[PDB]
Symmetry: C3
Subunit: 484 residues, 3 copies
């Protein structure tokens, strides 16, 4: 009668890492990292994104003539913008607090255009101005959402306009000022000198004086246009007054939906899919809790780790008694209790320690996945030319948190793998020690892992041993008899 204790072995070829060892073969391994994407920019939960194409956000909002397909826009999930869009400010100029506006838009879904100041009310001015820098079929044109006020005859009466926000939600209004390149152009466009533009609401209050200087010709013109914006609250009023150099708005952008969104800097084109989260390189379809594609993602999907391998060893060592190696024969459990009697042999497994080990390993896996749900998520942000210190601060903070969490994940995986391998070895050793303890001195220890019984006993005796019910006082006299 022999009762050898061992561990199940198989033919898997999965390798894991450890603190003391590298490239170790195990039986069962669970991967936690996804490294594949389909390389397609496409829908999020059935709502298509907004594709600006060769357009900028400023060009979309001001109404660039080239960007005429964005005049009416349905609900969206995210915004796709090129890194250096070509169609931006048709007329050269600047946008004040552009990056703050982009940050505000990042969490704003569907807009709704409202005609707040029609073009027919300006009866004492000319509203048909345009420039060749914004040309359609060769003829001069202008922004679609704004009006350029100019002389009518030879006078420029004081321009007044007001809007009381009775729409129902918050509204965004954009206005501008014009800066000519000489006094002659100012006199030929507005018939006044020392003009002003005044805007006033319940919170904001500006009065801007046009600035005239000689400048290089950008897009053919030496003049510039300065654009500002504000957010108008419910039941609030905005007032406009100008003796000259006013670019009045015609539409305000009501905020309609709101939600979680973002702006993506991609060079791709919209295709037809349906994914759950989207990265600037492609979509992700996964159930694993980590990925290594791109830090900036939109939707609900795994955390980002800057690593190439994250494999958790949930099985045993693959080395083909337990002092020589594993057993290929066993298929039931994890720990070996070889059967060999006179009437027959067998390969029965142990149902006691196996369940405990499975529960412990599953608890460890779940704890590892659970400890990392509080990771750091990066959010896109834009910074101007004179804000390089802030940009460096943001970049360094994001990189530092990413490195910290990558280190944490890798160290946890390594330590858990080492603990798992040692845990299995200790479990097998403890089972062998318990068998030797219970059986006591009524056997000889062969050395390879099992005992040669000193007393002849049968199926009932040794399944009693397996159940931990061997009774030393029950059968020892014949053992001592055959001891001689």
């Amino acid at each position: 009668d022999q009762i050898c204790i061992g561990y199940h072995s198989n033919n898997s070829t999965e390798k894991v890492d450890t603190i003391l060892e590298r490239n170790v073969t195990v039986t069962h391994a669970q991967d936690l990292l996804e490294k594949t994407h389909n390389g397609k920019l496409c829908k999020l939960n059935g709502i298509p994104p907004l594709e600006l194409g060769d357009c900028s956000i400023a060009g979309w909002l001001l109404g660039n003539p080239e960007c005429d397909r964005l005049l009416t826009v349905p609900e969206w999930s995210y915004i796709m913008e090129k890194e250096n869009p070509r169609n931006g400010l048709c007329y050269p100029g600047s946008f004040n607090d552009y990056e703050e506006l982009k940050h505000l838009l990042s969490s704003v879904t569907h807009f709704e255009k409202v005609k707040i100041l029609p073009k027919d009310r300006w009866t004492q001015h000319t509203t048909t101005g345009g420039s060749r820098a914004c040309a359609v079929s060769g003829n001069p044109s202008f922004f679609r959402n704004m009006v350029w006020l100019t002389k009518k005859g030879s006078n420029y009466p004081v321009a007044k306009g007001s809007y009381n926000n009775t729409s129902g939600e918050q509204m965004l209004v954009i206005w501008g000022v014009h800066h000519p390149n000489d006094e002659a152009e100012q006199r030929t466009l507005y018939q006044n000198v020392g003009t002003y533009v005044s805007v006033g609401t319940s919170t904001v209050n500006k009065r801007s004086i046009p600035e005239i200087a000689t400048r290089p010709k950008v897009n053919g013109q030496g003049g510039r246009m300065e654009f500002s914006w504000t957010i108008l609250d419910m039941l609030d009023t905005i007032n406009f007054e100008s003796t000259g150099n006013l670019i009045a708005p015609e539409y305000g952008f009501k905020i309609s939906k709101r939600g979680s969104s973002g702006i993506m800097k991609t060079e791709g084109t919209l295709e037809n899919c349906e994914t759950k989260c989207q990265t600037p390189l492609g979509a992700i379809n996964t159930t694993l809790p980590f990925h290594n594609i791109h830090p900036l993602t939109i939707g609900e999907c795994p955390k980002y780790v800057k690593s190439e391998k994250l494999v958790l060893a949930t099985g045993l060592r693959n080395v083909p008694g337990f002092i020589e190696g594993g057993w290929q024969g066993m298929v039931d459990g994890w720990y070996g209790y070889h059967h060999s009697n006179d009437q027959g042999s067998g390969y029965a497994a142990d149902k006691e320690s196996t369940q405990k080990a499975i529960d412990g390993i599953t608890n460890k896996v779940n704890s590892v996945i659970e400890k990392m749900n509080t990771q750091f998520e990066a959010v896109g942000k834009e910074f101007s030319n004179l804000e390089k210190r802030l940009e460096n601060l943001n970049k360094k903070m994001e990189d530092g948190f990413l490195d910290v969490w990558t280190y944490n994940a890798e160290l946890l995986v390594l330590m858990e793998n080492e603990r798992t391998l040692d845990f299995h070895d200790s479990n097998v050793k403890n089972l062998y020690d318990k068998v030797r303890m219970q059986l006591r001195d009524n056997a000889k220890e062969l050395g390879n892992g099992c005992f040669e019984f000193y007393h002849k006993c049968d199926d009932e005796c040794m399944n009693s041993v397996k159940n931990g019910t061997y009774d030393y006082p029950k059968y020892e006299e014949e053992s001592k008899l055959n001891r001689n």
Copy 2:
């Protein structure tokens, strides 16, 4: 003649958590987290806070007529403010660099009001102006700490004012400019167009022009007042000069105490205590090194971890015998030590507890606890800050930084406690096994092990011999022949 080795079990029901097992019962556990507070706003080391109430900081410094109880305030320890104070700028307007002023005030204790420009020196102008927006008992009034200069008769001569800071410390000066809502109002109040307000110090150079615009009515007025500030260095001079639209200061605020304080956003009222540190929800009076009430605290008290439970296992496992050794469970009789060494002689018995291993294990566990506590004293402490409407990027940056550091440190603390529990339980098991192995080793082969954790001596010894075996002075050559003779039977 029979010795045994086991461990100690008791009646405790504290539960601890481990990286592999959940809700494991132990003998002794030490708590580290604190989850209670009195829910009262009260004193810090005997110094009461500055309770603004319904007033804002601008309303306190400018002298809003509703904030007349704060004209002279004593030394404070922190400032209590509401999220949306009702009484701020009674006359509508703005306040340039408000948040920088609040950041400066977060580290400034007791002020001292000094009359730098008396109201009576303006003998060529009118100083009795006021608005119904800041009205007391129906009649018009104005800010208590400022002067509104208007024309006297039909003339507004150039107004000049200087102050040389000989007060002995740094001074805070606040001025303003009035923006009317048409040209007629400007001519009715100052009798001039194209006016200016100029302020000049050694490091400050400004010249503001009025901005006339059509605006809605806030608190009944269409005009606005813009306020600015500066910090005057010692032995420095500040100059004022204006053709119109000047809201001149009358008092200057002198920094006197300095120290560590803060601005707390709360909606409660002051009460009677004496606390060591204060949170916006209450106060903590304990000695544990962790808490989970609110990230922003003023004073000296534990660090913040976003966890619900943090218990360290400083004891054995609790699996007592159902209905005599470590293979079955623990013994209730060991009240002297941690590692039991039950003995039983021919004439008597007992439950003596070992000493050499117990003291070493106690020292090790205490060192581990102290190391865990000491490794986490370099945590991240959150500091309150305020941001404007056009600074959302900066606010998001600050919020993300604080939240990320809190998450990192919470993860560190939780993982450390888990690993400590695992290794402590394994340590105790290994130490019991080591003691048993040492006893078996010294015993050599002069006993038959019963299996249940202990062996019955083949040689018949007495109290002295078995005490020597306990101490570790068992001599094989002295008592081997009789043992062999007995085992021959």
Copy 3:
């Protein structure tokens, strides 16, 4: 006839720390922290730094009369500046976006002065203006890189000037405006009131109005000067137009080399070295992976840990069979097989488990060094008086990352030391257990960590025992006969 099992002991006096016990004596230890510097400021890879002395960046760029030794400056590796420089803006005033310019300079090597607007083209104005705030040898002087245009005779014609950047790289241009203290001074200097200064590029549009006010006297003057700057792109032109209060530039600064550099706030001078890594306190010359001198560093050299000692335990516990302690007479390896045959004895050491332990320890050391090479590196930054919140944010972020990484390193070292000591003890115990298992009952376990054979066998048999080729059916009969006695 008897063998024994043990480990190696010697007379080293290195102490390591562990999570369960402090100041443990070990045989072999490795240090990972550098705590020494030469206290000198000196060259980085053969290129000397730029020594500003008692001058600020603004003083160097605007041409202060005191900083006359920096008119021509060769290539550099880093910039030396004092906390409170003496010679800065000789004429009192301000510098717009000073910290952004310093950040731009933080990654810019060699400049090249280009004379863009000569001093002789202003044939309708007086260019010889000067002040006693910047005085050389008593007489009034001015900035060397700037021109002060005043009236000539009794007229101030409109002043125009343009430059087209054909130099071949980006060029930095600085201009200024003047603020007098009274209307009389403005009339004396320029003959016009309500003057303007206008600057225009393809991305910059500005119109500045002089601000006249009464101010205290700084450096003996009540006026102020405000300076601004811009970066000119290639093939882009800049236009200047003013009716007064214009401080025109004469030189532009072409960015010629670019690279990695920095600004270091120090008070020392330049000595002679050839270092690879420089700190504001001194230079570092080491191959260890960590240091604790100063967070700010220029060059390539170890990471910063805010700690006092970091020692990794490589060897065994140094206490002088394996139960009573280690052996002092073993020199070959770590785990030994002290044997004593009938005709002799010895102190042989095993060569199979020793290699495994050596490989494991080396892998652990290399791994510990490898995981900690993605640390956080601090970069110097400057903030103004009204940017206190940003400064506090930056300081708190840098400090927090420093503490996080210090904690990580310390915990790693402590846990690894515990694991190493336990690993060595377990390995020795495993060796003894495997020998005892292979010997089967043909042994009399003495207790002291080793036993006496029950069968008399020679050197070859003992070698076979040590090599794992011990044969039970070879010499068991005589052993049983002996044990029956």
